[PDB]
Amino acid sequence: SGTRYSWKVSGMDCAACARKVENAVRQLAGVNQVQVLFATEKLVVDADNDIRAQVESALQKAGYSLRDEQAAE
Ligand SMILES: [Zn+2]
């Protein structure tokens, strides 16, 4: 897999929220695969560029509060 990034998102609770989130991040560029696991308070992005600082901003704009959980485990 390219890279796996994740964030801890205290706000996503709905599949509609999830879809808007995965769209809100997917629209960027760098992001290849989106895996936004609402309710479990996390988003994962596979991005073969550099867009996390874009994602985080994107979610923050959309109206969430994520924060960087490192570049995988
Ligand atoms: Zn919601």
What residue spans define the domains of the chain? 1-73
Q: Rounded to the nearest whole angstrom, what is the distance from the C-alpha of residue 11 to the centroid of ligand 1? A: 7
The CA–CA distances, whole Å, from 11 to 15, 17, 29, 42, 49 equal: 12, 9, 24, 9, 26
Q: Rounded to the nearest whole angstrom, what is the distance from the C-alpha of residue 23 to the centroid of ligand 1? A: 15
Q: Establish whether 17 is an annotated binding residue.
A: yes
Tell me the technique behind this structure: NMR
Domain 1-73 sits in CATH 3.30.70.100: yes
Helix (H) or strand (E) holding 53: helix 52-62
Q: Establish whether 68 is an annotated binding residue.
A: no
Q: Establish whether 14 is an annotated binding residue.
A: yes
What tokens appear for 37 in the block? 């696991």
Q: Which residues contact 46 (CB under 8 A, 6 or more apart)?
A: 1, 2, 3, 4, 5, 31, 32, 33, 34, 35
The CA–CA distances, whole Å, from 54 to 4, 14, 28, 39 equal: 15, 22, 7, 22
